[PDB]
């Protein structure tokens, strides 16, 4: 039953993902390779992160044909199945740490606008991707934890003894999924909260990175931890063991869709790159006092409205747009001067001029602003 379903789902789902990866990941490789020509300090490191992710996923892409050919036969060649599993593991963990470092970079650029000048550098990016390659391959090196001879003889590679002991399961799982998952969650939540405080493309790309990370890594690592909790310190129960084996095998056959799921972060990063409540309520009060100036008779009322409008303009100026807000504050200043002089109708004329200045220079902001922030 479980074996028949295994064979059916494997033969059905490995066929498309190979072509999908070899097409879309290669397209991403080419696109970001052309994008690195721009050579800006902050506009390049992300492209090196993307090319690292694309290479890590292309590893799995090239592994898929080998895993298919070595599994469609009754284990004729047992040496290369270990290589296939090593490729899969290096792919997953390199992808995890690459996307997690991307989230670190985005969070440190958002929360600390000054440190990104000295942090985000193409040399730093090349160094960190090379470093993560080295450590991930070094941690994939000790996969020969079984008996020295014979070696494991199945491509789903359950393995035994010290593999599922705390000496191996924890130092791998905590340092490869749990810590990246936790720190990515913190970074992404803080980034989204800050961006929503400043309020779309950036929110979209952080959300896409977090969603891709969760969907592609949480199931397989949850299955790993569940097997550790079940086959070590929980009764077999037969039914639970069968269900958990089914779940972990499915996550094995569904985590290979990561090479395609990475397109959801690639596309949004590319859209953000092509394109390049605080602001919303600043615009709201600008319009509100602009409209209440018209229905006013006391000079004190128009003075108060102009004061609030000037405060809003000054606050929003810190988020072309520099000069537009400059002339907006200037016109608010003439309106305030006229109101202080005692004239009210002249304040209305100044407010009308302020309205046309806003419609001309300001409306481009709060429109592009609600497309990146």
């Amino acid at each position, epitope marked *: 039953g479980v074996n028949e379903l295994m064979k059916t789902l494997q033969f059905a789902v490995h066929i498309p993902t190979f072509v999908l990866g070899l097409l879309l990941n290669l397209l991403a490789i080419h696109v970001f390779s052309t994008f690195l020509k721009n050579r800006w300090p902050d506009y390049a490191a992300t492209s090196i992160y993307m090319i690292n992710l694309a290479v890590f996923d292309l590893l799995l892409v090239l592994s898929l044909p080998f895993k298919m050919v070595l599994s469609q036969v009754q284990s004729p060649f047992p040496s290369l199945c270990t290589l296939v599993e090593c490729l899969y593991f290096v792919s997953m963990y390199g992808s995890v740490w690459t996307i997690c470092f991307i989230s670190m970079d985005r969070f440190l650029a958002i929360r600390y606008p000054l440190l990104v000048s000295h942090l985000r550098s193409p040399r730093k990016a090349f160094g960190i991707c090379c470093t993560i390659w080295v450590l991930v391959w070094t941690g994939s090196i000790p996969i020969y934890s079984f008996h020295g001879k014979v070696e494991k003889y199945m491509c789903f590679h359950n393995m035994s003894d010290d593999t599922w002991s705390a000496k191996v399961f924890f130092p791998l799982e905590v340092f490869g999924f749990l810590l990246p998952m936790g720190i990515m969650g913190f970074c992404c939540s803080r980034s989204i909260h800050i961006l929503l405080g400043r309020r779309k493309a950036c929110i979209y790309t952080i959300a896409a990175s977090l969603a891709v990370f969760v969907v592609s890594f949480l199931p397989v690592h949850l299955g790993f931890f569940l097997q550790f909790l079940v086959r070590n310190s929980f009764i077999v129960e037969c039914r639970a063991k069968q269900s958990i084996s089914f779940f972990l095998q499915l996550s094995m056959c569904f985590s290979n869709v990561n090479c395609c799921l990475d397109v959801f972060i690639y596309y949004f990063v590319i859209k953000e790159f092509r394109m390049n409540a605080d602001l919303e309520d600043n615009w709201e009060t600008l319009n509100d006092n602009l409209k209440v100036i018209e229905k006013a008779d006391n000079a004190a009322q128009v003075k108060d409205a102009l*004061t609030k409008m*000037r*405060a*809003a303009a*000054l606050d929003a100026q810190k988020a072309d747009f520099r000069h537009g807000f*400059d002339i907006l504050v*200037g016109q608010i200043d003439d309106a305030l001067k006229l109101a202080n002089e005692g004239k009210v109708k002249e304040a209305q004329a100044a407010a009308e001029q302020l309205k046309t200045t806003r419609n001309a220079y300001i409306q481009k902001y709060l429109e592009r602003a609600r497309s990146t922030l």
Partner: antibody
Amino acid sequence: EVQLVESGGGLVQPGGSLRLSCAASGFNVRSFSIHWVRQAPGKGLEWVAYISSSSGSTSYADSVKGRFTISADTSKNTAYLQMNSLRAEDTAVYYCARWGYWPGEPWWKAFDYWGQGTLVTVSS
Amino acid sequence: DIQMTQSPSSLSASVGDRVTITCRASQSVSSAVAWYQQKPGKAPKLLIYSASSLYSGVPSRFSGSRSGTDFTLTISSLQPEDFATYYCQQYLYYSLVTFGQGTKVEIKR
């Protein structure tokens, strides 16, 4: 360097008149806004008036409006605040301060270069 | 009309502690806050123009920060020459400039 020297303050009977002339050296009164800030003895700082010779805009605080008239002659690069209808609550040390125009850094530096003060004392 | 109230009316500290003076505005002023230091019998001097910008000519011990409508001044490294009255000013517009009540920093003993 830029300096603001204020002179004129002294003994004035209640209801009298006095004219404090803060003189600007190092810049022009037409490129900066001159404000008057007064400090009652042992009390805090209170804004008095404001003059902008470039635009002719004059403003006064609520507790002073209608009595003192601020003026500035750009030929002499000096600003004059004219005491009128004085009362005992008006005795203080008067500070003439400069303030840049919009836009840019000069406006954001609110009162970078103050004066030296002139003790105006009023009582019968 | 834009009232500015600073909580510590008189704060006592020794030479070498962290001094925090907090200011609150009645209504929103974006960054139009300036901190002035007044030694007795002398004109005030600018310390922190804008919300956090540091004026050129005063030691880097003075720092400012903005939390919405709340403004704070930090003198984290005190010195025998930082004992004076510190004022909080809002300068949203020329005719609406208002000052705080002051904060006299004395010597703890």
